[PDB]
Amino acid sequence: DQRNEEKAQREANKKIEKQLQKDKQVYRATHRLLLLGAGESGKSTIVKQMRIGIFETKFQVDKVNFHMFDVGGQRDERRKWIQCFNDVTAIIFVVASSSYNMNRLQEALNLFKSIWNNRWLRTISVILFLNKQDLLAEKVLAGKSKIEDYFPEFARYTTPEDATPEPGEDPRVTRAKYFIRDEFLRISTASGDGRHYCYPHFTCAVDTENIRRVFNDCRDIIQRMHLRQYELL
Amino acid sequence: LDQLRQEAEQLKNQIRDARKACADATLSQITNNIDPVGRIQMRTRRTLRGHLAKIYAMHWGTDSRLLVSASQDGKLIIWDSYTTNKVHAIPLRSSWVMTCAYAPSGNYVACGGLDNICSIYNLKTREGNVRVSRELAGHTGYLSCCRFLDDNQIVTSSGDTTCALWDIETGQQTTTFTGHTGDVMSLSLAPDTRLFVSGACDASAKLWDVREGMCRQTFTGHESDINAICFFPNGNAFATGSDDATCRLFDLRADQELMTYSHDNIICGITSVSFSKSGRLLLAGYDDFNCNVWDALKADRAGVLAGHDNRVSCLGVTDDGMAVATGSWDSFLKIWN
Amino acid sequence: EVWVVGMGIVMSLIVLAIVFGNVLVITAIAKFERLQTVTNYFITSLACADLVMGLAVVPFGAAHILTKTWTFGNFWCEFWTSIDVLCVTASIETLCVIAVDRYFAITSPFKYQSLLTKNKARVIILMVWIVSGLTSFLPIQMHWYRATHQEAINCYAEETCCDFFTNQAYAIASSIVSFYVPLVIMVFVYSRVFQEAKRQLQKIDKSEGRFHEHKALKTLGIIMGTFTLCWLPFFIVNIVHVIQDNLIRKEVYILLNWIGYVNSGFNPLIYCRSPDFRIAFQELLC
Amino acid sequence: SIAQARKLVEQLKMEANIDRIKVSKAAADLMAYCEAHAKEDPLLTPVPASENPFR
Numbered sequence: 001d002q003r004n005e006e007k008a009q010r011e012a013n014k015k016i017e018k019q020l021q022k023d024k025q026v027y028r029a030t031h032r033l034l035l036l037g038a039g040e041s042g043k044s045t046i047v048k049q050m051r052i053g054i055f056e057t058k059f060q061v062d063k064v065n066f067h068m069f070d071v072g073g074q075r076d077e078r079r080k081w082i083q084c085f086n087d088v089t090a091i092i093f094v095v096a097s098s099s100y101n102m103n104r105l106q107e108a109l110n111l112f113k114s115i116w117n118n119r120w121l122r123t124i125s126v127i128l129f130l131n132k133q134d135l136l137a138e139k140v141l142a143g144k145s146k147i148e149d150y151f152p153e154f155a156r157y158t159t160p161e162d163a164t165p166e167p168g169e170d171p172r173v174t175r176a177k178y179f180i181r182d183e184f185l186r187i188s189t190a191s192g193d194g195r196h197y198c199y200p201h202f203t204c205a206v207d208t209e210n211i212r213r214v215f216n217d218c219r220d221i222i223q224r225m226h227l228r229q230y231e232l233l
Numbered sequence: 234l235d236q237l238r239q240e241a242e243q244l245k246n247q248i249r250d251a252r253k254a255c256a257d258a259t260l261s262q263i264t265n266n267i268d269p270v271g272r273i274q275m276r277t278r279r280t281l282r283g284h285l286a287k288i289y290a291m292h293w294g295t296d297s298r299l300l301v302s303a304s305q306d307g308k309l310i311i312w313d314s315y316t317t318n319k320v321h322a323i324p325l326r327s328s329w330v331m332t333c334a335y336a337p338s339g340n341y342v343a344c345g346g347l348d349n350i351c352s353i354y355n356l357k358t359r360e361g362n363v364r365v366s367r368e369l370a371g372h373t374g375y376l377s378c379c380r381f382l383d384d385n386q387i388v389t390s391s392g393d394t395t396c397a398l399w400d401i402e403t404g405q406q407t408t409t410f411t412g413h414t415g416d417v418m419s420l421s422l423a424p425d426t427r428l429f430v431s432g433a434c435d436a437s438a439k440l441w442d443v444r445e446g447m448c449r450q451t452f453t454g455h456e457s458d459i460n461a462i463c464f465f466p467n468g469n470a471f472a473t474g475s476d477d478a479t480c481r482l483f484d485l486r487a488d489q490e491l492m493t494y495s496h497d498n499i500i501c502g503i504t505s506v507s508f509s510k511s512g513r514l515l516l517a518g519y520d521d522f523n524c525n526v527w528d529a530l531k532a533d534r535a536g537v538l539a540g541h542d543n544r545v546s547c548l549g550v551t552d553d554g555m556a557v558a559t560g561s562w563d564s565f566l567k568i569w570n
Numbered sequence: 571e572v573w574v575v576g577m578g579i580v581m582s583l584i585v586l587a588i589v590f591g592n593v594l595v596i597t598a599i600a601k602f603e604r605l606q607t608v609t610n611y612f613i614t615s616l617a618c619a620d621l622v623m624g625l626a627v628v629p630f631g632a633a634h635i636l637t638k639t640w641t642f643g644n645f646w647c648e649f650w651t652s653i654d655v656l657c658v659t660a661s662i663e664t665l666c667v668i669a670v671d672r673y674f675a676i677t678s679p680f681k682y683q684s685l686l687t688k689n690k691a692r693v694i695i696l697m698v699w700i701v702s703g704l705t706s707f708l709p710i711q712m713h714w715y716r717a718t719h720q721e722a723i724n725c726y727a728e729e730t731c732c733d734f735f736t737n738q739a740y741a742i743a744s745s746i747v748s749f750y751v752p753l754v755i756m757v758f759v760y761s762r763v764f765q766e767a768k769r770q771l772q773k774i775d776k777s778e779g780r781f782h783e784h785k786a787l788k789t790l791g792i793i794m795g796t797f798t799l800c801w802l803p804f805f806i807v808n809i810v811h812v813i814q815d816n817l818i819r820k821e822v823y824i825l826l827n828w829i830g831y832v833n834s835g836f837n838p839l840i841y842c843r844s845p846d847f848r849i850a851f852q853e854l855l856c
Numbered sequence: 857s858i859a860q861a862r863k864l865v866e867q868l869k870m871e872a873n874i875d876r877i878k879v880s881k882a883a884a885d886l887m888a889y890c891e892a893h894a895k896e897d898p899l900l901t902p903v904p905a906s907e908n909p910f911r
């Protein structure tokens with residue numbers, strides 16, 4: 001009777017293992033992303049272009065499956081659940097660039113610095129979106145508010161020589177944008193350690209090319225990981 | 234207003250004086266002539282594979298044979314420890330789970346995670362297919378632990394600094410326990426299921442009353458977050474583990490701690506804590522990719538449990554004390570003896 | 571006799587190296603479950619081939635050279651030659667497969683998991699060992715390799731000399747199958763890999779150069795140079811001595827062939843330098 | 857939030873009037889149990905392989 005008993009589980013194990021083998025490829029194919037940003041970031045409008053206490057959007061670009069998460073976590077200065085997100089491909093960070101006086105920008109920098117140096121996120125890249133690039137231009141052009149009053153370091157900043165400003169824009173918005181970008185790139189480069197990088201970008205709600213940027217950034221991240229693994233980079 | 238608030242601080246002093254008065258002598262002075270347990274070496278007996286991602290929780294069955302485990306793939310697997318073969322595999326609606334439970338009657342299984350819902354699965358359908366029985370909602374934060382008090386009512390702790398008691402048939406909270414400031418990270422039930430404890434994130438472990446619904450005592454020993462908790466088998470004491478690489482043994486009747494378990498060569502956090510059948514051995518998993526075995530009455534190491542390639546995130550001892558199981562982020566489950 | 575005694579110690583050290591590294595690699599990959607990876611099956615196939623080569627063909631050739639006489643029968647001469655050719659032609663296609671695997675891993679990051687599966691790796695290793703075998707055993711077990719010049723006939727008749735004599739057809743076909751084909755593929759693959767590495771370095775420098783190729787050049791140079799220097803001259807003189815007679819002596823031939831045997835002793839030092847391998851080596855027997 | 861403060865002072869007054877026992881009896885009540893049940897566990901004492909189901 002016992003020998004017959006062995007047969008029954010022996011049979012059940014086989015179907016479950018076949019099912020697990022079937023699910024393994026589907027699990028391995030997909031790529032996971034985490035969407036994280038401050039309040040007033042613009043995360044709600046950015047996900048809309050993609051659509052064309054938990055929230056997931058699943059899409060496909062060039063026969064590649066991307067699955068994006070969005071954890072609310074409202075009013076939580078401490079984040080004990082972020083340990084679970086150490087296996088994602090990349091982390092998407094959204095910050096409103098025009099909110100340099102409403103300090104909210106300093107809060108965004110503090111959050112970015114806290115995220116970068118976390119123990120469990122030592123090998124996760126960050127894709128940076130500097131949202132609201134037209135409110136910033138309108139505010140700077142013929143605006144009473146001055147950046148130097150809120151940020152003392154802006155007085156001794158110069159326009160970079162390697163910059164590639166878009167056509168038709170004044171030098172003032174260019175210097176402001178590049179100063180804001182460098183304010184993040186400095187923290188990104190201070191303790192990079194050669195394992196993970198940051199990809200700054202400039203986006204506004206109308207732009208529809210974002211998803212292509214995410215695709216390219218993910219491809220570059222995987223290529224860099226593979227190149228470094230084989231002692232070539 | 235504020236003057237009433239002072240009266241409360243005066244009451245708090247009184248508590249400190251009352252606790253200090255009864256401290257005749259520490260446990261170390263009391264227990265010194267006892268012989269040490271010696272060197273204990275445990276060798277792996279079984280190893281279970283099949284999980285595609287990291288493992289977060291597990292719970293031994295009441296029959297000392299079956300055990301359940303949950304992973305971030307989104308699947309609950311029920312094993313058979315004797316013949317290392319699987320029985321069930323339940324896909325999940327949400328791929329993030331932080332806890333799991335096994336009913337004392339071996340009839341129900343629960344799980345919960347970032348989604349603010351505790352699900353209950355019926356193992357014994359007439360058809361023979363696992364399916365969702367009920368879905369409980371009402372929390373505003375991620376769940377951390379859940380234990381079956383009986384076959385019809387369950388207790389859960391969440392990340393909104395509250396603990397609640399549920400009714401499976403109706404689905405509405407019966408009693409809500411409030412008073413914590415930090416996140417609640419774990420809980421355990423007494424052998425008679427009349428009282429239970431909880432370890433918050435603000436370094437404060439409380440003792441609750443299931444029937445009445447009010448706090449009874451509060452202990453403020455640690456200085457950092459508390460990640461694990463469990464009762465002594467007698468039911469008069471409990472042990473907690475924190476991120477500062479120390480484990481403390483408290484006492485309900487005396488109302489303060491008695492011993493501390495720490496060493497100068499370890500500075501990493503602690504994830505799980507469990508006792509033994511007789512309460513003589515204290516087991517705790519660390520972030521050092523391995524485990525340690527303590528002596529309850531002397532605070533001295535008696536063995537090391539190594540073999541895991543990544544950090545340990547679970548630990549459990551069977552009812553009869555025949556084996557201890559550990560789960561790690563390496564997607565592996567091991568049985569020791 | 572002093573020179574013969576000196577040759578002996580060197581031959582003994584070479585045999586000891588060809589065995590210890592391969593057996594250590596096999597034991598390390600078998601003992602720990604964290605190294606059981608798809609890419610590591612090609613490495614263990616190469617290690618098995620090198621171990622069989624060093625434990626089978628090298629000591630017999632050493633004894634033959636030192637004794638200056640072949641003390642076995644004709645059947646063992648044929649078996650020894652066939653095993654030598656099998657090991658030599660199986661120790662290179664694995665390197666070609668490794669290069670192709672790295673190419674597919676780097677240049678197609680999104681289709682890497684789909685293209686290679688544990689089962690696909692087993693199928694490929696069998697093609698490598700069956701294809702090599704047809705050249706190694708079918709010509710030598712049958713009598714196709716043998717040449718009909720009179721000097722060759724004499725050595726065949728006697729039961730005390732076992733020397734390699736071969737016509738042009740086999741000397742060209744086996745050389746093309748074993749060496750020349752797995753060379754252009756590796757060159758092209760590594761050129762593309764270097765191009766990708768240079769592009770990535772340029773992109774990084776453009777992105778963040780203000781605030782903050784040698785590694786890739788060194789790695790590719792080591793990997794290509796060791797194999798090319800070890801196995802290149804022999805597979806040239808192989809065609810040379812047959813295309814025209816009385817150009818090379820047997821001493822130069824055997825010296826180049828034995829220099830080619832050395833390559834099997836360096837593969838663990840090239841393909842097993844990852845930090846995980848170092849940790850595994852420190853864990854056991856240390 | 858004055859009402860919340862009133863509740864907390866009540867809560868404190870409630871837990872204040874609890875009888876307590878000196879540490880000596882508490883430690884004795886643990887040592888006695890540990891000594892009494894020390895012979896009925898497989899972990900502290902190895903036990904023969906005949907009755908071990910895992911081996």
Ligand SMILES: Nc1nc2c(ncn2[C@@H]2O[C@H](COP(=O)(O)OP(=O)(O)OP(=O)(O)O)[C@@H](O)[C@H]2O)c(=O)[nH]1
Nearest residue numbers: 039040041042043044045131132133134203204205
């Ligand atoms: N021109 C412009 N307006 C924007 C942009 N992003 C947000 N806005 C405007 O900002 C206002 C509020 O932002 P919402 O689009 O509601 O997004 P949000 O509330 O910041 O989203 P969350 O980050 O999810 O909280 C609206 O008037 C939007 O039109 C942007 O990139 N460009």
Ligand SMILES: CN[C@@H]1CCc2c(ccc(O)c2O)[C@H]1O
Nearest residue numbers: 654655658659734741744745748
């Ligand atoms: C006796 N040694 C043999 C002789 C010729 C030969 C070798 C290897 C590969 C070939 O394709 C060959 O034709 C050598 O290992």
